[PDB]
Write a protein that binds this ligand. Structure first.
Ligand SMILES: [Ca+2]
Ligand SMILES: [Ca+2]
Ligand code: NA
Lengths: 246, 243
DNA sequence: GCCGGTCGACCGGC
DNA sequence: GCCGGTCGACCGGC
């Protein structure tokens, strides 16, 4: 992680900070801005990242060509836009943001990538652990890590930003965590909720003590297990209760 | 539908005015200017139903005000929020709310939900309403035998950024309970949500509401079964080889 | 404490 | 044409 080193300054900086008001999504703008002010050469929005990468090789055109530019089936898988969209990319037609992009920020250096996703959170309101990342996307991710044996390329990390309403919104606190540093098997997969791993960064454990490859293998086990179970529970929850009306 | 008659009226004005989109607010206005009398935001309606009965208090009691195991289900905000309600502590908008707009007149409820559709970006049908919520609804409907109480209608609002702002391009209007059930797409991963564009929605169903519920339920059961099988093939067969 | 449903609308593979 | 996964968080029942 490139950002733990200065997490305290981030912490201190953000705590206090305020934003306008019509959820606290725009708090991420500040993270990016701050990160942009103390890690300039490592910080990109994910679209911003693709852009630079496609600008650096203006001759490489066409999506299959541009895809080769990643040098990593896995990173290829997490950061890249679609074929047509890769096809039609151009200096006059840059990538813009996209709800469904994996990361909110990339910190990259010496060909190591940190994918930062910023979970905002209204602590005054209830406490509903939010979507973290797709369980299925995380699974395909692991398969690739083994299949290409890319176990020392990137990490997925989270920066919670707590805030509350005050006349203006203001961050009262923040947490930070590392995905690949948590227990694969304790991860809560919410299937209906777009199959999203769900937790509060605050409460995420970091006691994991094995290799990255092991982690992938343990996650894939958890996933498959929960997948089998879910298939079964659907009969109970979704069929059984309604057979009677037929 | 208290909308269908004046659909022409609505449509006409909608096209050409500007403002994720949120013309949802726009339309409300029209319906308020022209129907201020049976036009509520869902939550607004609730303050009204609660303001108009200052005697009844606590939740157990306040739900009787719905006089409907079904509307209750679809409209209620739930024990604690309801218990804690009072004129100095009114409901606000809740992301979770079933409806965007509510037209109720002579004890018939029209549950309206607009769908904004960036018509320039993609043809990605949006979530229309959780299929499982709907199941529960149909079940209640059946049970409590209340087929002539409420409609769930949609009104699409297309748009593009042809200018400094967005801009409505055109609209559409369908009725969930006029569609063929067995035909509705249930995207399980997407919050178990029925997905469609209003413009493409079949409106050719000619049975009883009782029939519609019975058919929709069969469709749900069938589709819940295939999804469970889909999971094995999609999220189990392909990864077993890594363990 | 524990658990999992809902709104919102969004591409892109073949 | 046919399909369906993804980000965003967010509530209440026992
Ligand atoms: Ca985020
Ligand atoms: Ca809506
Ligand atoms: Na809906």
């Amino acid at each position: 992680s490139f950002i733990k080193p200065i997490y305290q300054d981030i912490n201190s900086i953000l705590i206090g900070q305020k934003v306008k008001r019509p959820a606290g999504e725009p708090f991420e703008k500040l993270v990016y801005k701050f990160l942009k002010e103390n890690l300039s050469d490592l910080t990109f929005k994910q679209y911003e990242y693709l852009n630079d990468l496609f600008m650096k090789n203006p001759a490489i055109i066409g999506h299959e060509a541009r895809y080769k530019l990643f040098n990593s089936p896995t990173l290829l898988f997490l950061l890249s836009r679609g074929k047509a969209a890769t096809e039609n990319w151009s200096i006059e037609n840059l990538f813009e943001e996209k709800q469904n992009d994996t990361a909110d920020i990339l910190l990259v250096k010496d060909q190591f990538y940190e994918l930062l996703d910023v979970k905002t959170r209204n602590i005054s309101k209830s406490a509903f652990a939010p979507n973290i990342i797709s369980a299925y996307k995380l699974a395909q991710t692991c398969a690739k890590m083994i299949d290409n044996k890319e176990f020392d390329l990137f990490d997925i990390n989270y920066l919670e930003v707590d805030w509350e309403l005050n006349g203006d919104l203001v961050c009262v606190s923040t947490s930070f965590a590392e995905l690949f540093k948590s227990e694969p098997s304790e991860l809560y997969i919410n299937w209906a909720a777009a199959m999203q791993i769900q937790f509060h960064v605050r409460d995420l454990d970091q006691g994991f003590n094995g290799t990255r490859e092991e982690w992938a293998k343990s996650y894939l086990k958890h996933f498959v297990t929960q997948a089998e179970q879910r298939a079964i529970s659907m009969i109970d929850k979704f069929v059984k209760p309604f057979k009677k009306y037929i």
